[PDB]
Structure 1
Amino acid sequence: QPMEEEVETFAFQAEIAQLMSLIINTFYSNKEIFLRELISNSSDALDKIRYESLTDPSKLDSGKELHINLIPNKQDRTLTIVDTGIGMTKADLINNLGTIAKSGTKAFMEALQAGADISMIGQFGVGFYSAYLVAEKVTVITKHNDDEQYAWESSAGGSFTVRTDTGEPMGRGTKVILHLKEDQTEYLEERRIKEIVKKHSQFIGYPITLFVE
């Protein structure tokens, strides 16, 4: 006592910050697509660890099952999406969630200006930010082989934090925790989640399981 935790704060690239502002404040009526985008990202992460394991089977020693889990929680108002994909290193987190999306978010924002639909966000490689359609804050917990477990967090205030996660180890993969907006709690309902998964992610090549109490 006490334990000491160092936290690093980073600014988003200007265009990523602009897109996050647009997304978190839009009145877009087809917000359910956020789940499709996150599940698609998880599928890609699972494809990556599968690819590595083609050459080195020991890459799955940290977790043999390749799947996606959905966990709603009405008591803390969160929807969690967990995958056992490749996971991210600290640099992956800092770069892929705060800097590398600048180009894509710019191309997407120009597309929106030209009449494109928000549902096309995934084609620009920045679908992760669609989480802010329904969430006021997002927490990302990730674990990559040969690296420590990290926690990323942002409330779309122009910055994000990264720190070493002291919580329960994940083995390998990524956990996206959506802290839902007060008027978006419908996404915590078992029936609504099933409907959205069937409608937009039925053909995902990894098992998607919905955990309920």
Structure 2
Amino acid sequence: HVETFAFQAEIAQLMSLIINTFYSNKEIFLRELISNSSDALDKIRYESLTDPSKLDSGKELHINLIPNKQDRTLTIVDTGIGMTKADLINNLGTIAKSGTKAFMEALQAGADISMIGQFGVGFYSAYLVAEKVTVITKHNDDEQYAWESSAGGSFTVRTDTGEPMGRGTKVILHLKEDQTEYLEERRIKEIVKKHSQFIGYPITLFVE
């Protein structure tokens, strides 16, 4: 069944900032997730170096960007370490909760949002483009989970029953009505080339 959680009020508060503040340079939302995905392919390249039985859930280490116009969705799939329940529910909430304050202190004093990454809170970047985000993730030690939040204070998590994804994180952006420009191949290739040309993992932009 579906469990409902509340955001730590600092996370809540953040998500509003992102959602309601005027900021036109939204495309950066994507290199944050690319980057994030690289950070989770790093973690598992590394661990498998000592324990190669960790790759039994999938030898192949790659990023996939998937645009779906009919759904209004860009998913960023990745074969990374993945997230456990304790991750989704309590461990991420914890780290995120410092990243948030620093990021927000650093805001008057005129840093800005394209910098949310140097603060550990990149993932929340999605909220620039996404009206609801759905994380489908699969760790080696735990069950497969779906996390979802349309923001506004609360997130859900359930055990998934979709395609068994083997090991990874899929992040399905359910884009707002006026942001469909990131559903366009020509527009996705330009951001990748601009902001993520050095990611040491195969990035595959699916066409439609």
Scaled by the length of structure 1, the TM-score of the pair is 0.95
Give the Cα–Cα distance (whole angstroms) in 2 for the partners of residues 96 and 30 of structure 1.
Answer: 30
Pairwise CA distance, 1:162: 0.6
Q: Which runs of 5+ in 2 are unaligned?
A: none
Question: What is the rounded CA distance, in whole Å, between the counterparts of 1:65 and 1:26 in structure 2?
Answer: 39
Question: Residue 86 of structure 1 corresponds to which residue in structure 2?
Answer: 81
Q: CA deviation at 1:97?
A: 4.1
Per-residue CA deviation, residues 128-186 of structure 1 (Å, 9 max, x unaligned), is: 10000000100000100121100000011101001100111100000000000101000
C-alpha separation in 2, matches of 1:154 and 1:32: 21
Return the alpha-carbon distance in structure 2 between the equivalents of residues 181 and 83 of structure 1: 23
- Residues 1:111 and 2:86 aligned together: no
The range that moved more, 32-41 or 99-108, is: 99-108
Specify the alignment match of 2:206 in structure 1.
211
Superimposed CA distance per residue, residues 63-113 of structure 1 (whole angstroms, 9 cap, x where no aligned partner) = 111000000000010000000000011101112443431111111011112
**Contact 1:86 1:145 (8 Å CA) reproduced:** yes
SS in 1 for 2:179: helix
What secondary structure sits across from 1:85 in the alignment? coil
Is 1:191 aligned to residue 186 of structure 2?
yes
1:26·1:133 contact (CA, 8 Å) conserved in 2?
A: no
Query: Which residue among 141, 147, 156 is the counterpart of 2:136?
Result: 141
1:73 to 41, 54, 68: 68
1:15-56 CA distance string (max 9 Å, x none): 111110010122201100000000000000000011111011
8 A contact 1:70–1:81 mirrored in 2 = yes
- Which of 182, 186, 202 in structure 1 is aligned with 2:177? 182
Conserved 8 A contact 1:11-1:98: no
Distance across 1 between alignment mates of 2:109 and 2:9? 20
Query: Displacement of 1:11 after TM fit?
Result: 0.7
Q: Is the 8 A contact 1:12 1:99 kept in 2?
A: no
SS of equivalent residue, structure 1 residue 205? coil
Distance in 1, Cα, partners of 2:174 & 2:129: 8
* Secondary structure, aligned partner of 2:106: helix
User: Residue 142 of structure 1 contacts residue 172 of structure 1 at CA under 8 Å; is this kept in 2?
Assistant: yes
TM-score (norm 2): 0.98
SS in 2 for 1:179: strand
Question: In the alignment, what sits opposite 1:45?
Answer: 40
Q: Structure 2: how far apart are the matches of 1:38 and 1:155?
A: 18
- For structure 1, the residue ranges without an aligned partner over 5 or more in a row are 1-5
Question: Is the contact between residue 141 and residue 174 of structure 1 (CA under 8 Å) also seen in structure 2?
Answer: yes
SS of residue paired to 1:115: coil
Identity percentage of aligned residues: 100
Coordinate RMSD, CA, aligned: 0.9
Moved more, 102-111 or 35-44: 102-111
Aligned residues: 208
Give, in angstroms, the shift of residue 126 of structure 1.
Answer: 0.4
Partners in 2 of 1:58 and 1:140 — Cα distance?
25
